[PDB]
Amino acid sequence: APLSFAQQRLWFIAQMSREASGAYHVPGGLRLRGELDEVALRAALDRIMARHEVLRTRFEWHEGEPVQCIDAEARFPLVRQELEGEAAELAHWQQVEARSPFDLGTGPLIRGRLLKLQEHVLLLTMHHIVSDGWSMSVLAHELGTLYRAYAQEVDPLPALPLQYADYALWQRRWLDGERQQRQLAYWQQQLAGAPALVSLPTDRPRPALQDYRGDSIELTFDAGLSQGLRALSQRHGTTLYMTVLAAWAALVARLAGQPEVVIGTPVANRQRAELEGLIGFFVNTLALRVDLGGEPSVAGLLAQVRERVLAAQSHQDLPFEQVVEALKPERSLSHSPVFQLMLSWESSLAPVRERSAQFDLSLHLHEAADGTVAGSLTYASALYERETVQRHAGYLKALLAGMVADDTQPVQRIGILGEAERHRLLVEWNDTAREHPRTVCVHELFEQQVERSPDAVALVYEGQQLSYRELDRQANRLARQLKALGVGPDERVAVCTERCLEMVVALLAVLKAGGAYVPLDPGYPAERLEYMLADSAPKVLLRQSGQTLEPGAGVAVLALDGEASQPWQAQPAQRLSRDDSGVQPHHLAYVIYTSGSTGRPKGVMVEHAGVVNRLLWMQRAYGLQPQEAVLQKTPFGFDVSVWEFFWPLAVGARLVMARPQGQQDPAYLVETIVGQDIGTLHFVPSMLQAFVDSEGVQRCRGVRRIVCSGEALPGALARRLRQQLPQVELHNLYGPTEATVDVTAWACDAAELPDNIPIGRPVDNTTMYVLDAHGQPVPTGVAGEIHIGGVQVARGYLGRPELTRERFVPDPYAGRPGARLYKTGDLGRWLLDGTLEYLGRND
Ligand SMILES: Nc1ncnc2c1ncn2[C@@H]1O[C@H](COP(=O)(O)O)[C@@H](O)[C@H]1O
Ligand SMILES: [Cl-]
């Protein structure tokens, strides 16, 4: 049972308060090994309390603003504990200790949980309004020294030079001065026009409200990589933090497809030596804008990062909140402002696993004792899966290694893919090899079905019917007349007719005569039909009676129906032998013209073998049975009609030829579906929308399969079809004409359909590749240009050899000499489940 919209948002609002309870505290712990001497702790504990004025400072409202109340020096509030277990005891105790809220009014802001587990567990906690990250590190310096003094006080040994109230009084004057304005002018200039949101590929769409659920992984740079990065940093004058910042910004810009990347970094902001050792809120955030346009080298990028990091650390006094309200006074609610990725360098007991994510990714790294670099990468679980973050950390380590190998190469072309993912992308997700007969042509699939069911119904048109044997005999007669007119292998036969029984007779007869058919839709303007008729240079024009299209140019014209078609009824109805025609699977099956994009239409030459594979895959995936009917509704100038014609005829089903221009009657489609028991039909998504919006669509409960292709299928439309026809199996198919109708398919059978309906997995004997501008495979989730391989790649464009070599390129992956890929010009990406997602056009 789903929650309402008001209930769903109110839940996320209530959990932001739970996120605030844990993220506004500074937890920590220390393992104590030594003689049981509590007699020295309380003396050492209260000594650090009274030493720093912030440890006992209270806050409250007075005269419309929060006031600072310096309190009389008090004692430490420690709770006695006696541990009872191990795993569940320590993990839960240490968790609720950090999540236990304080009170800014009364009650102290330093909290401690001590326990005897000889050996004691000393948990400490401070509030962020009186401390930060460093403030606990100096809390460990004093606590360790004061216990030593109380074992062998505070201020007399080494007094503190200042207290936080003096820093706040100084900041109040600095914020009003002209140095604040100039630092505000630099940050307004540095981050002007910066990308508001990084487009890192996410495994799930970004929620409307930011989800603070977080998880983390562990990553380390081994002794070799940490050593090489130190030498690389020495050679370019950068520190080890700047070298990692350059690599991470280089990785993110490559993964997100953006030129610039903004990465945040927390700084202590204790620039003045007086503030060192003091306890309080000093940490500030700097937004680092790294540009990567122009394809810089490793040295050029490190020099850019060297300039921007130094300039950022010189203007680190301005609060980051004032940077936002100046640049972005109008911000979003689904992501953090200015930046969404943070890199913290923690150069130096241990804390627990970070389960909160204030940003998309937060990379924490530190320099270990053995010279190695270790840390964690915390990610928002609502955006990324764990395996995606692990591959992300692998890319960074791979990119850092390449920078050490050569600091002069282009940084954005360094290989980052691991061998496991590369093999999965290229081979494992393309394991579509299926054993189909590579010796059969398209018309022979029909002829084999004629022998199995000669008296079964094959064609239906406005009451007229043709059985499999009757259709085959009619096609054989016309095929012999075509053979007498020079039709043979690779020769074209133009066909100009409206939908009728004779349309299918013509197509089968051309294929039987060994030629390739060229569909000429009479609805197109005469100028277009005359160009395609001249460009294809056919041997014969099969013309329906009433059509006035005249080719000239020595082209033979045969009447397809009417009284003028009677002469070729005298031909014998027997089948032409395999040698009488001479056609083979590598010969052309049809030439279908696409309008290109802007200009003259181009004839796509498609061979028999690819069409047979496309048809044989469709039956294996969907199992069309002889008793079913398919509706021939798509104009035969579109290659969708190819499987509408030849899929049912190859398996024993019947094909219902829709009325010409019949859908002009708004009720014709529904009445024909019900009246003819239509089980399978095709829609382009724009036409499917009109179908689910049409009157009486719910009467079509007998429909079995709806194939969608040609456009992007919106998930809302797919979900609308379920509500109207709960029984129909919806399938999303993708593929251009140059790859034989379709090459990927995705069943819309999931219990919950996404808004972006995937185009799916490659079909039988077909391969798919997502490549960058240099023909290299991109990481999972990264957008790139779709390339198609396998048997369904067309021969090329009829009469345009230069465009053919431009879009039909050698296949370097198939391991087969002579194989070719088709560059689609479409943008796509792999999902982590091995399915493809259409994203749009490359241009
Ligand atoms: N299922 C689909 N989803 C999104 N786009 C598609 C799909 N099928 C085809 N296209 C686009 O339409 C172009 C031509 O497809 P077609 O009309 O089937 O030849 C392709 O090159 C793609 O850009
Ligand atoms: Cl050309």
Ligand SMILES: [Mg+2]
């Ligand atoms: Mg297609």
